[PDB]
């Protein structure tokens, strides 16, 4: 089940949600939260509709009339004529799947290196080697917020995270960084959060 | 439709063939009056329900 992206909502509307169907190789190619890009064909699917208003019956074209005691009236006649309601839903049949915004042009560092192209890999390498990368990342990630350099640095470290670990007895050592911002109103806290999300 | 010549060597008595029948249900006693019988040598299969 997918729903329309926020970039396409009309005014005052609720996003339209439709079910798309993946077949064969693509069966598990979409995961929750992903901004996928389904390519395929729209289709209709017969529906067992609960509409109490009759509509669009389909029946035989052979003119047959029940004899006395077996008249084509009621459920008997409906069944004999083969009357069925033509109620449909719109469903999407996706042959291929792919993210809307590709990140690159199990998981491991070598896997990421291979997945990313030569230009992207060289850019990553050169920025990794670049000096003052800490300040560069902070500034490039928060180009509108002034001050709060400590908050910027903390959020960057949170984004990079730690190294989760598990002890011999089983107890786990959390490696994720938790950050909280407390302060006076209009101090850019929501701005930091929205930067992080976007 | 055929027109043929012959000689009648027998003639059965004149009996009563129903052209309409009224069938009544045993349980509710409701009727299905005026069921059009076919003409000639032919029978009728009563409704089962
Ligand atoms: N230190 C700051 N530097 C740049 N802009 C700021 C700063 N503090 C507040 N603002 C501006 O004030 C606006 C409202 O801030 P807001 O996100 O509501 O903070 P809070 O949620 O903590 O009240 C923001 O859109 C932001 O541009
Ligand atoms: Mg706020
Ligand atoms: Zn009866």
In DSSP notation, B1-49 reads: -----------PPP----SEE--B-TTT--B---EEPPSSS--------
How was this model experimentally determined?
cryo-EM
- Those residues whose C-beta lies under 8 Å from the C-beta of residue A83, and which sit 6 or more positions away, are A57, A58, A59
Q: Tell me the C-alpha distance between B7 and B13, whole Å.
A: 18
Q: Tell me the C-alpha distance between A11 and A88, whole Å.
A: 27
Q: Tell me the C-alpha distance between A69 and B34, whole Å.
A: 11
Ligand 1 environment, Cβ below 6 A: A 145-148, 185-191
Are B46 and A69 an interchain contact pair (Cβ–Cβ within 8 Å)?
Answer: yes
Chain A positions in Cβ-Cβ contact with residue B47 (cut-off 8 Å): 68-70
The CA distances from residue A89 to A30, A63, A188, in Å, are 22, 31, 46
- A195 among the known binding-site residues? no
Q: In terms of C-beta distances under 8 Å and separation of at least 24 residues, what long-range contacts does A158-165 make, across chains too? A: A159/A196
Resolution for this experimental structure (Å): 2.8
B47 contacts chain A (CB < 8 A): yes
Q: B17 to chain A nearest CA, in Å?
A: 19
């Amino acid at each position: 089940r997918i729903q329309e992206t926020q970039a396409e909502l009309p005014r005052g509307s609720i996003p339209r949600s439709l079910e798309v169907i993946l077949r064969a190789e693509a069966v598990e190619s979409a995961q929750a939260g992903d901004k996928c890009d389904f390519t395929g064909t729209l289709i209709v699917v017969p529906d067992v509709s609960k509409l109490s208003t009759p509509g669009a019956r389909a029946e035989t074209n052979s003119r047959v009339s029940g004899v006395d005691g077996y008249e084509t009236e009621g459920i008997r006649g409906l069944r004999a004529l083969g009357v069925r309601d033509l109620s449909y839903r719109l469903v999407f049949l996706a042959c291929c799947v792919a993210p809307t915004n590709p990140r690159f042009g199990e998981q491991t560092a070598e896997s990421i290196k291979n997945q990313m192209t030569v230009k992207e890999w060289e850019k990553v390498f050169e920025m990794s080697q670049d000096k003052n990368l800490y300040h560069n990342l902070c500034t490039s990630l928060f180009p509108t917020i002034h001050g709060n350099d400590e908050v910027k640095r903390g959020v960057l470290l949170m984004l990079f995270g730690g190294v989760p670990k598990t002890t011999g007895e089983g107890t786990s050592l959390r490696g994720d960084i938790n950050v909280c911002i407390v302060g006076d109103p209009s101090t850019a806290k929501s701005q930091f959060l929205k930067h992080v999300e976007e | 439709l055929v027109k043929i010549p012959g000689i009648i060597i027998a003639a059965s008595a004149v009996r009563a063939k129903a052209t309409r029948i009224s069938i009544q249900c045993r349980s509710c006693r409701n009727t299905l009056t005026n069921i059009a019988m076919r003409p000639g040598l032919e029978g009728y299969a009563l409704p089962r329900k």
